[PDB]
Scaffold this active site. Structure first.
Site, PDB file in Angstrom:
ATOM      1  N   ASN A 117      90.687  32.357  -2.254  1.00  0.00           N
ATOM      2  CA  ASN A 117      89.694  33.379  -1.876  1.00  0.00           C
ATOM      3  C   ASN A 117      89.667  33.625  -0.382  1.00  0.00           C
ATOM      4  O   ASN A 117      89.896  32.717   0.420  1.00  0.00           O
ATOM      5  CB  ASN A 117      88.294  33.037  -2.423  1.00  0.00           C
ATOM      6  CG  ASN A 117      87.475  32.151  -1.490  1.00  0.00           C
ATOM      7  OD1 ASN A 117      86.761  32.650  -0.614  1.00  0.00           O
ATOM      8  ND2 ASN A 117      87.559  30.843  -1.677  1.00  0.00           N
ATOM      9  N   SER A 187      87.227  22.925  12.552  1.00  0.00           N
ATOM     10  CA  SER A 187      87.861  21.979  13.519  1.00  0.00           C
ATOM     11  C   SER A 187      87.370  22.008  14.997  1.00  0.00           C
ATOM     12  O   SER A 187      87.701  22.962  15.716  1.00  0.00           O
ATOM     13  CB  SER A 187      89.386  22.186  13.518  1.00  0.00           C
ATOM     14  OG  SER A 187      90.074  21.302  14.381  1.00  0.00           O
ATOM     15  N   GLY A 269      90.382  24.226  -6.460  1.00  0.00           N
ATOM     16  CA  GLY A 269      90.804  23.769  -7.777  1.00  0.00           C
ATOM     17  C   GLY A 269      91.701  22.548  -7.712  1.00  0.00           C
ATOM     18  O   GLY A 269      91.677  21.797  -6.733  1.00  0.00           O
ATOM     19  N   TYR A 319      83.236  24.397  -8.645  1.00  0.00           N
ATOM     20  CA  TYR A 319      83.204  25.828  -8.903  1.00  0.00           C
ATOM     21  C   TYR A 319      84.451  26.242  -9.693  1.00  0.00           C
ATOM     22  O   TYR A 319      84.326  26.670 -10.834  1.00  0.00           O
ATOM     23  CB  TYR A 319      83.027  26.600  -7.593  1.00  0.00           C
ATOM     24  CG  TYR A 319      83.007  28.123  -7.670  1.00  0.00           C
ATOM     25  CD1 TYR A 319      82.961  28.833  -8.899  1.00  0.00           C
ATOM     26  CD2 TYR A 319      83.002  28.875  -6.494  1.00  0.00           C
ATOM     27  CE1 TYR A 319      82.968  30.204  -8.931  1.00  0.00           C
ATOM     28  CE2 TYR A 319      82.986  30.266  -6.530  1.00  0.00           C
ATOM     29  CZ  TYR A 319      82.967  30.921  -7.749  1.00  0.00           C
ATOM     30  OH  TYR A 319      82.958  32.287  -7.804  1.00  0.00           O
TER      31      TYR A 319
END
Ligand SMILES: CCn1c(CO)nn(-c2nc(O[C@@H](C)C(F)(F)F)c(C(=O)Nc3c(C)cnc(OC)c3Cl)cc2F)c1=O
Ligand SMILES: Cc1cc2nc3c(=O)[nH]c(=O)nc-3n(C[C@H](O)[C@H](O)[C@H](O)COP(=O)(O)O)c2cc1C
Ligand SMILES: O=C(O)c1cc(=O)[nH]c(=O)[nH]1
Length: 358
Positions: A117, A187, A269, A319
């Site tokens: 995404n 970062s 994922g 998610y």
């Protein structure tokens, strides 16, 4: 079981069929809508006392939350508890409304059980979300009392010159409506982070005691060893209430097969899972097990959840698994976690937290 059969039908047939018929953003938009309307089963998985966790000044009925990004604008909070999530994190919410990046900006890698995404913090803005949460404020107070807390992830506007003030605005507007707040950190250097988090905590401490949320820092998995060392130090120094470990990865692990693997964005994922678990492991050790961690990245099973818990997570979120498995995944993860906890001799989730480190 009936659960495993239902779980198989969603994973094998319904979700691949629906995802074949819809672009990924429409699928997301429809999911939010269906969830907002409560178009879900009643509750076949009643939560075991084994799953109860007490952390962040709150009872969590179970440790499986919905991660930030599904419900960016707080439209589906009640449906998400109905789905069986022990806590709901909404957002990211930016101060002003903004559209985010041009479409297409979400991409499915089904061969990898992954998503990329680049939403770009599309948000209805603090004002819209505030009034939306105000409409159900007392319903939420009861839910929180019953062990179902609400988190809010606070973002910043794209063109913001002062990141700390955008987050501060978010603490003032939505902090009174949240059980915890989340600020994403990228970062660092260390002094800039200390400055930003000091301001966030000052603003939080300025709210009345009854409406005073925990403040957590959410990190990506792409930080250097020095970034992680510095974050751990600052978090302990300032009394940050917890860590969310991790966001999506800008990396592309070797072995991704999806055609869309080279799309710009954050990868989530299954390919993120062990990168995320190892980051939890590192942050737990650098904070001496004294900073609660929410573990997130590639959770699609009880084993995945337990690995994060044993690595140092008090709670987990998911998610991406929801996009491939649908609503039954929540019951699946909880059932499998409970079974594994019993198989490993843990009285409940609390006993398993950081067990690998002992
Ligand atoms: C990353 C963006 N993204 C993608 C693409 O990568 N998918 N996705 C999701 N899509 C979902 O369903 C769609 C296929 C829908 F069109 F059906 F809405 C759901 C979902 O839970 N859907 C539901 C509900 C709520 C109730 N009842 C059901 O069936 C009886 C189903 Cl299938 C959850 C998701 F996270 C999502 O957020
Ligand atoms: C479509 C999408 C949108 C997301 N939006 C946000 C966001 O606005 N803020 C945030 O902190 N994390 C966001 N995330 C990150 C998730 O909260 C989570 O950290 C990440 O996806 C890893 O978990 P998963 O592998 O279970 O999806 C998003 C993830 C996806 C896939
Ligand atoms: O809105 C987004 O693009 C986004 C935010 C975030 O924190 N993580 C992510 O993967 N995407």
């Amino acid at each position: 079981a009936m659960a495993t059969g239902d779980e198989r039908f969603y994973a094998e047939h319904l979700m691949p069929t629906l995802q074949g018929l819809l672009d990924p953003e429409s699928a997301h938009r429809l999911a939010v809508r269906f969830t907002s309307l409560g178009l879900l089963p009643r509750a076949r998985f009643q939560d075991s006392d084994m799953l109860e966790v007490r952390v962040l000044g709150h009872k969590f009925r179970n440790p499986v939350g919905i991660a930030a990004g599904f419900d960016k604008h707080g439209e589906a909070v009640d449906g998400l508890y109905k789905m069986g999530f022990g806590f709901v994190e909404i957002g990211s919410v930016t101060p002003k409304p903004q559209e985010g990046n041009p479409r297409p900006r979400v991409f499915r890698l089904p061969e990898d059980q992954a998503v990329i995404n680049r939403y770009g913090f599309n948000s209805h803005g603090l004002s819209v979300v505030e009034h939306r949460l105000r409409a159900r404020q007392q319903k939420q107070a009861k839910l929180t009392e019953d062990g179902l807390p609400l988190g809010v992830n606070l973002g910043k506007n794209k063109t913001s010159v002062d990141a700390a003030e955008d987050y501060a605005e978010g603490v003032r507007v939505l902090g009174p409506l949240a059980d915890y707040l989340v600020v994403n950190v990228s970062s660092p250097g260390k002094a800039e982070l200390r400055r930003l988090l000091t301001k966030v905590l000052q603003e939080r401490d300025g709210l009345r005691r009854v409406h005073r949320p925990a403040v957590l820092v959410k990190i990506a998995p792409d930080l250097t060893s020095q970034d992680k060392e510095d974050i751990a130090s600052v978090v302990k120094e300032l009394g940050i209430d917890g860590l969310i470990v991790t966001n999506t990865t800008v990396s592309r692990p070797a072995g991704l097969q999806g055609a869309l693997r080279s799309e710009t964005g954050g990868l989530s994922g299954k390919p993120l899972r062990d990168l995320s678990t190892q980051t939890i492991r590192e942050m737990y050790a650098l904070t001496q097990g004294r900073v609660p961690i929410i573990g997130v990245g590639g959770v699609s099973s009880g084993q995945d959840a337990l690995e994060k818990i044993r690595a140092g997570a008090s709670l987990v979120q998911l998610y991406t698994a929801l996009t491939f498995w649908g609503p039954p995944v929540v019951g699946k993860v909880k059932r499998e976690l409970e079974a594994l906890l019993k198989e490993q001799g843990f009285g409940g989730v609390t006993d398993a937290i950081g067990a690998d480190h002992r």
